[PDB]
PDB file of C-alpha atoms in Angstrom:
ATOM      1  CA  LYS A   1       6.690  23.198  -3.616  1.00  0.00           C
ATOM      2  CA  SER A   2       4.446  21.922  -6.420  1.00  0.00           C
ATOM      3  CA  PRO A   3       3.875  18.141  -6.173  1.00  0.00           C
ATOM      4  CA  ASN A   4       4.981  17.322  -9.729  1.00  0.00           C
ATOM      5  CA  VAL A   5       8.596  18.464  -9.308  1.00  0.00           C
ATOM      6  CA  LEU A   6       8.560  16.966  -5.791  1.00  0.00           C
ATOM      7  CA  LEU A   7       8.165  13.542  -7.423  1.00  0.00           C
ATOM      8  CA  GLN A   8      11.386  14.141  -9.361  1.00  0.00           C
ATOM      9  CA  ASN A   9      13.204  15.162  -6.166  1.00  0.00           C
ATOM     10  CA  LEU A  10      12.013  11.871  -4.639  1.00  0.00           C
ATOM     11  CA  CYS A  11      13.351   9.938  -7.640  1.00  0.00           C
ATOM     12  CA  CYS A  12      16.833  11.428  -7.166  1.00  0.00           C
ATOM     13  CA  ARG A  13      16.880  10.588  -3.490  1.00  0.00           C
ATOM     14  CA  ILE A  14      15.843   6.937  -3.971  1.00  0.00           C
ATOM     15  CA  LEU A  15      17.925   6.288  -7.066  1.00  0.00           C
ATOM     16  CA  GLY A  16      21.404   7.771  -7.438  1.00  0.00           C
ATOM     17  CA  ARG A  17      20.426   8.845 -10.956  1.00  0.00           C
ATOM     18  CA  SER A  18      19.970  12.538 -11.786  1.00  0.00           C
ATOM     19  CA  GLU A  19      16.745  14.187 -12.960  1.00  0.00           C
ATOM     20  CA  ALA A  20      18.116  14.863 -16.451  1.00  0.00           C
ATOM     21  CA  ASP A  21      19.717  11.417 -16.822  1.00  0.00           C
ATOM     22  CA  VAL A  22      16.356   9.639 -16.908  1.00  0.00           C
ATOM     23  CA  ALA A  23      12.814  10.773 -17.503  1.00  0.00           C
ATOM     24  CA  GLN A  24      11.113   7.353 -17.580  1.00  0.00           C
ATOM     25  CA  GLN A  25      11.027   6.912 -13.798  1.00  0.00           C
ATOM     26  CA  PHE A  26       9.649  10.419 -13.373  1.00  0.00           C
ATOM     27  CA  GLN A  27       7.140   9.582 -16.115  1.00  0.00           C
ATOM     28  CA  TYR A  28       5.962   6.561 -14.147  1.00  0.00           C
ATOM     29  CA  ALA A  29       5.620   8.767 -11.052  1.00  0.00           C
ATOM     30  CA  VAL A  30       3.520  11.179 -13.119  1.00  0.00           C
ATOM     31  CA  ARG A  31       1.554   8.162 -14.436  1.00  0.00           C
ATOM     32  CA  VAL A  32       0.457   7.006 -10.978  1.00  0.00           C
ATOM     33  CA  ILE A  33       0.106  10.362  -9.179  1.00  0.00           C
ATOM     34  CA  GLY A  34      -1.809  11.885 -12.075  1.00  0.00           C
ATOM     35  CA  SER A  35      -5.512  10.934 -12.233  1.00  0.00           C
ATOM     36  CA  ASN A  36      -5.144  10.274  -8.499  1.00  0.00           C
ATOM     37  CA  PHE A  37      -4.023  13.875  -8.032  1.00  0.00           C
ATOM     38  CA  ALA A  38      -6.530  14.778  -5.278  1.00  0.00           C
ATOM     39  CA  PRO A  39      -6.940  12.800  -2.032  1.00  0.00           C
ATOM     40  CA  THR A  40      -9.920  10.475  -2.274  1.00  0.00           C
ATOM     41  CA  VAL A  41      -8.950   7.618   0.065  1.00  0.00           C
ATOM     42  CA  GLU A  42     -10.485   7.242   3.533  1.00  0.00           C
ATOM     43  CA  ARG A  43      -8.597   6.815   6.797  1.00  0.00           C
ATOM     44  CA  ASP A  44      -9.395   4.486   9.658  1.00  0.00           C
ATOM     45  CA  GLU A  45      -6.255   4.840  11.770  1.00  0.00           C
ATOM     46  CA  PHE A  46      -7.900   3.160  14.784  1.00  0.00           C
ATOM     47  CA  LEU A  47      -7.936  -0.225  13.033  1.00  0.00           C
ATOM     48  CA  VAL A  48      -4.393   0.200  11.752  1.00  0.00           C
ATOM     49  CA  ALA A  49      -3.109   0.994  15.280  1.00  0.00           C
ATOM     50  CA  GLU A  50      -4.818  -2.191  16.464  1.00  0.00           C
ATOM     51  CA  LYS A  51      -3.100  -4.031  13.612  1.00  0.00           C
ATOM     52  CA  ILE A  52       0.376  -2.784  14.526  1.00  0.00           C
ATOM     53  CA  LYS A  53      -0.132  -3.981  18.112  1.00  0.00           C
ATOM     54  CA  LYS A  54      -1.034  -7.510  16.946  1.00  0.00           C
ATOM     55  CA  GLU A  55       2.144  -7.530  14.830  1.00  0.00           C
ATOM     56  CA  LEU A  56       4.304  -6.504  17.760  1.00  0.00           C
ATOM     57  CA  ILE A  57       2.766  -9.267  19.881  1.00  0.00           C
ATOM     58  CA  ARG A  58       3.561 -11.622  16.963  1.00  0.00           C
ATOM     59  CA  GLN A  59       7.281 -10.833  17.425  1.00  0.00           C
ATOM     60  CA  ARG A  60       6.858 -12.274  20.970  1.00  0.00           C
ATOM     61  CA  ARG A  61       8.396  -9.067  22.343  1.00  0.00           C
ATOM     62  CA  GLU A  62       5.506  -7.821  24.466  1.00  0.00           C
ATOM     63  CA  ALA A  63       7.167  -4.913  26.245  1.00  0.00           C
ATOM     64  CA  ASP A  64       7.743  -3.239  22.871  1.00  0.00           C
ATOM     65  CA  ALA A  65       4.113  -3.689  21.786  1.00  0.00           C
ATOM     66  CA  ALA A  66       3.150  -1.315  24.614  1.00  0.00           C
ATOM     67  CA  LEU A  67       6.074   1.051  24.087  1.00  0.00           C
ATOM     68  CA  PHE A  68       4.773   1.668  20.571  1.00  0.00           C
ATOM     69  CA  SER A  69       1.356   2.371  22.092  1.00  0.00           C
ATOM     70  CA  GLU A  70       2.772   5.278  24.087  1.00  0.00           C
ATOM     71  CA  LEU A  71       4.761   6.453  21.073  1.00  0.00           C
ATOM     72  CA  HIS A  72       1.606   6.249  18.954  1.00  0.00           C
ATOM     73  CA  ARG A  73      -0.212   8.408  21.518  1.00  0.00           C
ATOM     74  CA  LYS A  74       2.366  11.193  21.036  1.00  0.00           C
ATOM     75  CA  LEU A  75       1.435  11.803  17.387  1.00  0.00           C
ATOM     76  CA  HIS A  76      -2.094  12.714  18.500  1.00  0.00           C
ATOM     77  CA  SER A  77      -0.672  14.557  21.522  1.00  0.00           C
ATOM     78  CA  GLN A  78       1.177  17.068  19.334  1.00  0.00           C
ATOM     79  CA  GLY A  79      -1.354  17.174  16.499  1.00  0.00           C
ATOM     80  CA  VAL A  80       0.357  19.511  14.015  1.00  0.00           C
ATOM     81  CA  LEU A  81       0.014  16.939  11.240  1.00  0.00           C
ATOM     82  CA  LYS A  82      -2.463  16.470   8.389  1.00  0.00           C
ATOM     83  CA  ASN A  83      -3.384  12.804   8.751  1.00  0.00           C
ATOM     84  CA  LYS A  84      -1.687  10.481  11.181  1.00  0.00           C
ATOM     85  CA  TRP A  85      -2.949   7.588   9.054  1.00  0.00           C
ATOM     86  CA  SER A  86      -1.094   8.313   5.817  1.00  0.00           C
ATOM     87  CA  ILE A  87       2.614   7.988   6.672  1.00  0.00           C
ATOM     88  CA  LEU A  88       1.792   5.017   8.903  1.00  0.00           C
ATOM     89  CA  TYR A  89      -0.056   3.285   6.057  1.00  0.00           C
ATOM     90  CA  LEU A  90       2.947   3.912   3.786  1.00  0.00           C
ATOM     91  CA  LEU A  91       5.358   2.560   6.408  1.00  0.00           C
ATOM     92  CA  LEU A  92       3.246  -0.514   7.115  1.00  0.00           C
ATOM     93  CA  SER A  93       2.818  -1.390   3.440  1.00  0.00           C
ATOM     94  CA  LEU A  94       6.561  -1.498   2.736  1.00  0.00           C
ATOM     95  CA  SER A  95       7.301  -3.968   5.503  1.00  0.00           C
ATOM     96  CA  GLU A  96       9.909  -6.681   5.332  1.00  0.00           C
ATOM     97  CA  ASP A  97      10.331  -9.481   7.854  1.00  0.00           C
ATOM     98  CA  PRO A  98      12.954  -8.796  10.571  1.00  0.00           C
ATOM     99  CA  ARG A  99      12.063 -12.428  11.478  1.00  0.00           C
ATOM    100  CA  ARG A 100      11.502 -11.404  15.114  1.00  0.00           C
ATOM    101  CA  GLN A 101      13.709  -8.238  15.444  1.00  0.00           C
ATOM    102  CA  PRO A 102      17.086  -9.344  16.944  1.00  0.00           C
ATOM    103  CA  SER A 103      17.443  -5.790  18.459  1.00  0.00           C
ATOM    104  CA  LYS A 104      15.775  -2.431  19.122  1.00  0.00           C
ATOM    105  CA  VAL A 105      17.420   0.602  20.729  1.00  0.00           C
ATOM    106  CA  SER A 106      14.102   1.954  22.143  1.00  0.00           C
ATOM    107  CA  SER A 107      15.490   5.527  21.807  1.00  0.00           C
TER     108      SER A 107
ATOM    109  CA  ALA B   1       9.411  34.118  19.398  1.00  0.00           C
ATOM    110  CA  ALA B   2       8.539  31.145  21.614  1.00  0.00           C
ATOM    111  CA  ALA B   3       5.507  29.576  19.911  1.00  0.00           C
ATOM    112  CA  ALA B   4       7.339  29.781  16.559  1.00  0.00           C
ATOM    113  CA  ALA B   5      10.240  27.673  17.848  1.00  0.00           C
ATOM    114  CA  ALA B   6       7.785  25.381  19.639  1.00  0.00           C
ATOM    115  CA  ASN B   7       6.151  24.858  16.239  1.00  0.00           C
ATOM    116  CA  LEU B   8       9.615  24.101  14.832  1.00  0.00           C
ATOM    117  CA  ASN B   9      10.024  21.695  17.755  1.00  0.00           C
ATOM    118  CA  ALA B  10       6.723  19.896  17.115  1.00  0.00           C
ATOM    119  CA  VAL B  11       7.778  18.686  13.674  1.00  0.00           C
ATOM    120  CA  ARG B  12      11.290  17.761  14.853  1.00  0.00           C
ATOM    121  CA  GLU B  13       9.840  15.572  17.605  1.00  0.00           C
ATOM    122  CA  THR B  14       7.359  13.850  15.302  1.00  0.00           C
ATOM    123  CA  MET B  15      10.085  13.208  12.726  1.00  0.00           C
ATOM    124  CA  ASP B  16      12.084  11.536  15.527  1.00  0.00           C
ATOM    125  CA  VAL B  17       9.280   9.236  16.693  1.00  0.00           C
ATOM    126  CA  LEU B  18       8.469   8.331  13.092  1.00  0.00           C
ATOM    127  CA  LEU B  19      12.133   7.404  12.698  1.00  0.00           C
ATOM    128  CA  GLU B  20      11.670   4.739  15.375  1.00  0.00           C
ATOM    129  CA  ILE B  21       8.464   3.619  13.648  1.00  0.00           C
ATOM    130  CA  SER B  22      10.387   3.341  10.364  1.00  0.00           C
ATOM    131  CA  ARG B  23      12.934   0.882  11.675  1.00  0.00           C
ATOM    132  CA  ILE B  24      10.597  -1.297  13.711  1.00  0.00           C
ATOM    133  CA  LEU B  25       8.328  -1.883  10.703  1.00  0.00           C
ATOM    134  CA  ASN B  26      11.468  -2.581   8.624  1.00  0.00           C
ATOM    135  CA  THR B  27      11.196  -0.387   5.563  1.00  0.00           C
ATOM    136  CA  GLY B  28      14.067   0.496   3.257  1.00  0.00           C
ATOM    137  CA  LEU B  29      13.322   4.184   3.656  1.00  0.00           C
ATOM    138  CA  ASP B  30      15.851   6.208   5.628  1.00  0.00           C
ATOM    139  CA  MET B  31      15.354   9.618   7.259  1.00  0.00           C
ATOM    140  CA  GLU B  32      16.145  11.541   4.056  1.00  0.00           C
ATOM    141  CA  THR B  33      13.512   9.751   1.976  1.00  0.00           C
ATOM    142  CA  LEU B  34      11.218   9.956   5.017  1.00  0.00           C
ATOM    143  CA  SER B  35      11.313  13.751   5.005  1.00  0.00           C
ATOM    144  CA  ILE B  36      10.033  13.940   1.443  1.00  0.00           C
ATOM    145  CA  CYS B  37       7.272  11.422   2.153  1.00  0.00           C
ATOM    146  CA  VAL B  38       6.227  13.320   5.292  1.00  0.00           C
ATOM    147  CA  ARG B  39       5.973  16.557   3.261  1.00  0.00           C
ATOM    148  CA  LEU B  40       3.820  14.767   0.665  1.00  0.00           C
ATOM    149  CA  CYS B  41       1.492  13.419   3.326  1.00  0.00           C
ATOM    150  CA  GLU B  42       1.487  16.847   4.994  1.00  0.00           C
ATOM    151  CA  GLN B  43      -0.245  18.113   1.894  1.00  0.00           C
ATOM    152  CA  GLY B  44      -2.367  14.977   1.775  1.00  0.00           C
ATOM    153  CA  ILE B  45      -1.900  12.298  -0.898  1.00  0.00           C
ATOM    154  CA  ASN B  46      -2.907   8.640  -1.392  1.00  0.00           C
ATOM    155  CA  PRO B  47      -0.468   6.401   0.504  1.00  0.00           C
ATOM    156  CA  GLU B  48      -1.709   3.625  -1.785  1.00  0.00           C
ATOM    157  CA  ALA B  49      -0.174   5.562  -4.654  1.00  0.00           C
ATOM    158  CA  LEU B  50       3.100   6.225  -2.839  1.00  0.00           C
ATOM    159  CA  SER B  51       3.488   2.555  -1.830  1.00  0.00           C
ATOM    160  CA  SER B  52       3.262   1.273  -5.414  1.00  0.00           C
ATOM    161  CA  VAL B  53       5.681   3.932  -6.638  1.00  0.00           C
ATOM    162  CA  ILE B  54       8.317   3.105  -4.021  1.00  0.00           C
ATOM    163  CA  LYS B  55       7.885  -0.617  -4.582  1.00  0.00           C
ATOM    164  CA  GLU B  56       8.798   0.084  -8.200  1.00  0.00           C
ATOM    165  CA  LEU B  57      11.564   2.699  -7.655  1.00  0.00           C
ATOM    166  CA  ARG B  58      13.308   0.442  -5.186  1.00  0.00           C
ATOM    167  CA  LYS B  59      12.881  -2.297  -7.798  1.00  0.00           C
ATOM    168  CA  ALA B  60      14.356   0.164 -10.321  1.00  0.00           C
ATOM    169  CA  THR B  61      17.812   0.195  -8.725  1.00  0.00           C
ATOM    170  CA  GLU B  62      18.322  -3.462  -7.700  1.00  0.00           C
ATOM    171  CA  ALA B  63      17.708  -4.986 -11.143  1.00  0.00           C
ATOM    172  CA  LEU B  64      18.172  -2.038 -13.510  1.00  0.00           C
ATOM    173  CA  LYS B  65      21.424  -0.653 -12.054  1.00  0.00           C
TER     174      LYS B  65
ATOM    175  CA  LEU C   1     -26.880 -21.069 -43.833  1.00  0.00           C
ATOM    176  CA  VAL C   2     -24.732 -22.922 -41.314  1.00  0.00           C
ATOM    177  CA  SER C   3     -22.368 -19.978 -40.844  1.00  0.00           C
ATOM    178  CA  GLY C   4     -25.093 -17.951 -39.112  1.00  0.00           C
ATOM    179  CA  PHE C   5     -25.705 -21.054 -37.056  1.00  0.00           C
ATOM    180  CA  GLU C   6     -22.052 -21.081 -35.956  1.00  0.00           C
ATOM    181  CA  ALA C   7     -22.216 -17.321 -35.263  1.00  0.00           C
ATOM    182  CA  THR C   8     -25.170 -17.640 -32.911  1.00  0.00           C
ATOM    183  CA  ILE C   9     -23.550 -20.705 -31.258  1.00  0.00           C
ATOM    184  CA  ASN C  10     -20.410 -18.705 -30.516  1.00  0.00           C
ATOM    185  CA  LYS C  11     -22.441 -15.778 -29.178  1.00  0.00           C
ATOM    186  CA  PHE C  12     -24.268 -18.141 -26.816  1.00  0.00           C
ATOM    187  CA  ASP C  13     -21.015 -19.866 -25.819  1.00  0.00           C
ATOM    188  CA  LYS C  14     -19.216 -16.625 -24.937  1.00  0.00           C
ATOM    189  CA  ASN C  15     -22.195 -15.338 -22.954  1.00  0.00           C
ATOM    190  CA  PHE C  16     -22.764 -18.608 -21.052  1.00  0.00           C
ATOM    191  CA  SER C  17     -19.078 -18.991 -20.156  1.00  0.00           C
ATOM    192  CA  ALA C  18     -18.894 -15.383 -18.928  1.00  0.00           C
ATOM    193  CA  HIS C  19     -21.999 -15.785 -16.774  1.00  0.00           C
ATOM    194  CA  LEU C  20     -20.752 -19.106 -15.398  1.00  0.00           C
ATOM    195  CA  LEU C  21     -17.569 -17.458 -14.187  1.00  0.00           C
ATOM    196  CA  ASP C  22     -19.515 -14.483 -12.775  1.00  0.00           C
ATOM    197  CA  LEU C  23     -21.872 -16.743 -10.829  1.00  0.00           C
ATOM    198  CA  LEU C  24     -18.996 -18.729  -9.398  1.00  0.00           C
ATOM    199  CA  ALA C  25     -17.363 -15.455  -8.406  1.00  0.00           C
ATOM    200  CA  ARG C  26     -20.509 -14.266  -6.636  1.00  0.00           C
ATOM    201  CA  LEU C  27     -20.844 -17.611  -4.836  1.00  0.00           C
ATOM    202  CA  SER C  28     -17.180 -17.737  -3.815  1.00  0.00           C
ATOM    203  CA  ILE C  29     -17.322 -14.688  -1.514  1.00  0.00           C
ATOM    204  CA  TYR C  30     -19.697 -16.562   0.842  1.00  0.00           C
ATOM    205  CA  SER C  31     -18.653 -17.382   4.452  1.00  0.00           C
ATOM    206  CA  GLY C  32     -21.235 -28.212   5.322  1.00  0.00           C
ATOM    207  CA  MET C  33     -21.965 -25.424   2.928  1.00  0.00           C
ATOM    208  CA  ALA C  34     -19.174 -25.604   0.318  1.00  0.00           C
ATOM    209  CA  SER C  35     -20.539 -28.837  -1.150  1.00  0.00           C
ATOM    210  CA  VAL C  36     -22.390 -26.790  -3.781  1.00  0.00           C
ATOM    211  CA  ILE C  37     -19.200 -25.328  -5.287  1.00  0.00           C
ATOM    212  CA  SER C  38     -17.211 -28.550  -4.867  1.00  0.00           C
ATOM    213  CA  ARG C  39     -19.952 -30.643  -6.479  1.00  0.00           C
ATOM    214  CA  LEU C  40     -20.530 -28.368  -9.498  1.00  0.00           C
ATOM    215  CA  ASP C  41     -16.882 -28.742 -10.569  1.00  0.00           C
ATOM    216  CA  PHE C  42     -16.014 -32.312  -9.627  1.00  0.00           C
ATOM    217  CA  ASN C  43     -13.196 -32.529 -12.192  1.00  0.00           C
ATOM    218  CA  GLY C  44     -13.097 -28.856 -13.078  1.00  0.00           C
ATOM    219  CA  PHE C  45     -14.100 -27.155 -16.291  1.00  0.00           C
ATOM    220  CA  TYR C  46     -14.356 -23.313 -16.337  1.00  0.00           C
ATOM    221  CA  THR C  47     -13.323 -23.310 -12.678  1.00  0.00           C
ATOM    222  CA  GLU C  48     -11.246 -20.149 -12.598  1.00  0.00           C
ATOM    223  CA  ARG C  49      -9.934 -19.199 -16.025  1.00  0.00           C
ATOM    224  CA  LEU C  50      -9.134 -15.584 -15.132  1.00  0.00           C
ATOM    225  CA  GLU C  51      -7.146 -14.837 -11.988  1.00  0.00           C
ATOM    226  CA  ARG C  52      -8.445 -12.166  -9.632  1.00  0.00           C
ATOM    227  CA  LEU C  53      -6.712  -8.985 -10.789  1.00  0.00           C
ATOM    228  CA  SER C  54      -5.641  -6.237  -8.397  1.00  0.00           C
ATOM    229  CA  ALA C  55      -3.860  -2.891  -8.321  1.00  0.00           C
ATOM    230  CA  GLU C  56      -3.532  -0.129  -5.740  1.00  0.00           C
ATOM    231  CA  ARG C  57      -5.090   3.326  -5.990  1.00  0.00           C
TER     232      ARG C  57
END
């Protein structure tokens, strides 16, 4: 796929609105992605792994801070990806407070 | 083949571990939205862009709808 | 005239205010050492008139 129409697919997954109903949301997506069209940011995924472990200690669940460490190893173990840093940076930035996480299935 | 289904396995595993990572960091993104974002970062794209967009698009259906 | 007087006064005022805020910005990033910044504005005036703006790339 081309990235520009991929933005409009993303807008119809997040919002229930169709891609012909609105064009303003897609225009804002074009506003931010355009003139940032190429990757120029740098990754330091070592520091961000060390920052997820401090967060999982902060929950005061310490067995799960080391379970994430072995699940974080597996992304390098397969290694079919582009950057391991990018999706993890996205998923860290959108965080809300589970207050201490009153459950986790642990797969 | 075998290495062609093992390549199809190696995305399906990673999408399953990232699904655990998505709920323990508490985002509002589910698996369906996750698959689009993982394709975008498979091509390579600023996550700093994507974060500001989704902070607005999620804010575009809880006060505008 | 006195209008050209006022014009030069306003030029000097704008430039001095801008440089005052820039110097306080360049001193604020540092680190009984904060007594310089606390003494210079003991009641405040031109302390921080523009908030630190930010956006993501």
